[PDB]
Amino acid sequence: GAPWWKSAVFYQVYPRSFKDTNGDGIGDFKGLTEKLDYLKGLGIDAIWINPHYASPNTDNGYDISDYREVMKEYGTMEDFDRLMAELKKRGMRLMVDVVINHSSDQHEWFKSSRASKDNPYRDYYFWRDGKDGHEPNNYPSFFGGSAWEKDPVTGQYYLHYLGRQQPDLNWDTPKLREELYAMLRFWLDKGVSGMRFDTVATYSKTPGFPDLTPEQMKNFAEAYTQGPNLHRYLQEMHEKVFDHYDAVTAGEIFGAPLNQVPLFIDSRRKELDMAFTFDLIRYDRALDRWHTIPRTLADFRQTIDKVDAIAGEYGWNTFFLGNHDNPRAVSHFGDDRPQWREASAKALATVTLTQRGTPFIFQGDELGMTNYPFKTLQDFDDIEVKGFFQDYVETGKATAEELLTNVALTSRDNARTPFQWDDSANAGFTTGKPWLKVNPNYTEINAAREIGDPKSVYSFYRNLISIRHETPALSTGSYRDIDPSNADVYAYTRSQDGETYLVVVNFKAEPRSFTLPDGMHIAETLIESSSPAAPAAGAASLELQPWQSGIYKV
Ligand SMILES: [Ca+2]
DSSP states (O other): OOOGGGTOOEEEEOHHHHOOSSSSSSOOHHHHHTTHHHHHHHTOOEEEEOOOEEOOOTTTTSSOSEEEEEOGGGOOHHHHHHHHHHHHHTTOEEEEEEOOSBOOTTSHHHHHHTTOSSSTTGGGBOEEOOBTTBOSSOOBOTTSSBSEEEOTTTSOEEEOSSOTTOOBBOTTSHHHHHHHHHHHHHHHTTTOOEEEETTGGGSSOOTTOOOOOHHHHHTHHHHTTOOTTHHHHHHHHHHHTGGGSOOEEEEEOTTOOGGGTHHHHOGGGOSOSEEEOOTTTTTTBOTTSSSBOOOOHHHHHHHHHHHHHHHTTTOOBEEOSOOTTSOOHHHHHSOOSTTTHHHHHHHHHHHHTTSSSEEEEETTGGGTOOOOOOOSGGGOOOHHHHHHIIIIITTTSSOHHHHHHHHHHHOTHHHHSOOOOSSSGGGGSOSSOOSSOOOGGGGTSOHHHHHTOTTSHHHHHHHHHHHHHHOTHHHHSEEEESOTTOSSEEEEEEEETTEEEEEEEEOSSSOEEEEOOTTOOOOEEEEEESOSSOOOTTOSEEEEOTTOEEEEEO
16 A cells, blocks of 8 residues: 555645735744645645745745744744644644755854854855855856855855855765754654655765866756765665654755656655656746746656656656746646636646646645736845846846846746735735735635635636545556647546546647547546536547546546
8 A cells, every 4th residue: 555645635835925814914824724724625635834944034934044943924833833733633744844955144053164164063064265266166056146155254165056145054074964864853753744855956065066067057957966975865864864754755856857866766765755856847947047948738748758757666756837936837837818717727737636646736726826917126026036137137148128028937936926815905815015915816816716616726626636535546546648749638547456547638728639549438527627518428539628628537
C-alpha cells in the first residue's frame, strides 16, 4: 500500500495573503485557522504553508531571522499550535516551508559572522576576497546586481544567490549543518507532517568559486545547482533527521536539469520523497525570467511527459499549475478573458487532479482567480521586479514601459493578491488596507458566490477532488499520453489494476474532434466541463466544445 502522500490533495496557503483577522491588511494564523472548514469542505487533505518564522520580510518570510519563532505578523507560537491542533481535529496535515539555503542578514548567526574574520560563526556563511579590485567572481544574483556583497568591517564579500539581505548558509561547515538538523527536529517534534525545501538544489557551492562561463552566465540558475557535495548533504540530513520521523519531504528543485531530478527523489537514495520541478511552470519563460516565449499545448504535454518519465519506478512528482512564485494558472495556461475564464479554469482543474503525482492547488485557483491588472511599476511589491529594474532599466537594456508590459504577465505578485472570500470591502480578506491591492474582478470572483453555485469553478474543483479520492488509478496509476504531437486536444490514460481512465481536455476556444485509440471505448463518463451531453456507452470518438474537459472510464 503506497504512502498517504501519493494519494493526498495538497493546498498551498500563502499566509500573508490568505486571511487577516486584525485589520493590518496582512493575513495571519487566526485567519487560516478560521478557514479550515472551507479547506476541509473543498476536499483538501494537507496544506503547505509558506514560511511562518520570525523575519524582517525583505522577501516575505524567505529571509528568516530566527528559525524557532513564528513571524510576528502571523501571530504567536500558541496560534501556530492551535493551527496544528485544529487541523488534527479534521484529520488534515501540515507541511511547512523550510528555508535553509540562506538566512536573513538579521539572523544572530550572520550578525556574529560579519563581526570579524575570526569568530565561531565566520564559516556559517561564505566570505571571500575580491578579485582584481572587484567582487570575488562574476556570479549574478536573482534579485539584481551581484551575488557578492562587500562588508567594510572585514573587507570581504559575502555570498547571496537571493537578495542582499539573504546571505547563503555554508553547508560545507559541519557545525552549521548540525544546527540546521537540530532546527528541523524542533519543528518535527511538534508533529509537523511535511517539509518543503526552498531552493533545495543550491545548498552545495562550487569549491574555488571560479567564474561562470559566458554560457553558464545566461543560465545562472542551473550553474547554482551543480555543487559537488549536494547529494551527500541531502543524504546526511535524511539520515540524521528524516529517518527518525514520519514526515514527507519535498524539494523545490529550481534550476536543476531534468535528468538530475531522480537523484533527489529515487526512494532508494534516501534523500527526498517528492519533487517540485519547474520545467512546466517555466516552459514559456525566457532565460531572463521576465519575458515569455509563445508555446503550444504540444510543448506543454511533452514537458509533462518528460517530467513523468523521470519519476520512474521509485521517485515521485508533485504536480502544480501555480505557486507564490509564478503568474496565475488560468491566465498563464488558460484563457482568462471573461467569456473563457470559467471554462478554462475548469479544464486546468481536470488536468491538475488527473496527473500522476501529488497535486498541489494554489490558494485562489479553485475560484479561477486571475493575474492582477498592474498599471505602474509602483504597483509591484515584489523584490524580484526591483531587481529587474536594477539589471535592465538602470543599465539602459530596457525601458520602464517594456519592463512593466512584460513583468505584468510574469511577476510573482499576480499570485500574491489577497484571496477573494466574498464581495464585501476588499473581498472580505481584511477590514483594513490590504498589503497588496485586491483584484477588482473580486466582485465577480469570490468564494461566497462560488460555493453557492453547483456550476462554479469551486464546485467543479470539489467534485474532481471527490472523484480523485474514489478512484485510485487517478493518483497512483500509470500515465500515458495518447498523442504528444497534438497541439489542440490534450488526452491521456491513467491505469491501475485492470481499470483505465481517459482524460480529454480541449485547449482551443473552438469545437474539436477527438478520436479514441483504436479499440478503446467509453464505458462510463465520470465528469465533464462545458459539455452539453456525455458520450454514449461504447463511443469510439468525442465532439468537444470550446475548452471542454472530461474523465471517462474506458
Ligand atoms: Ca493580520
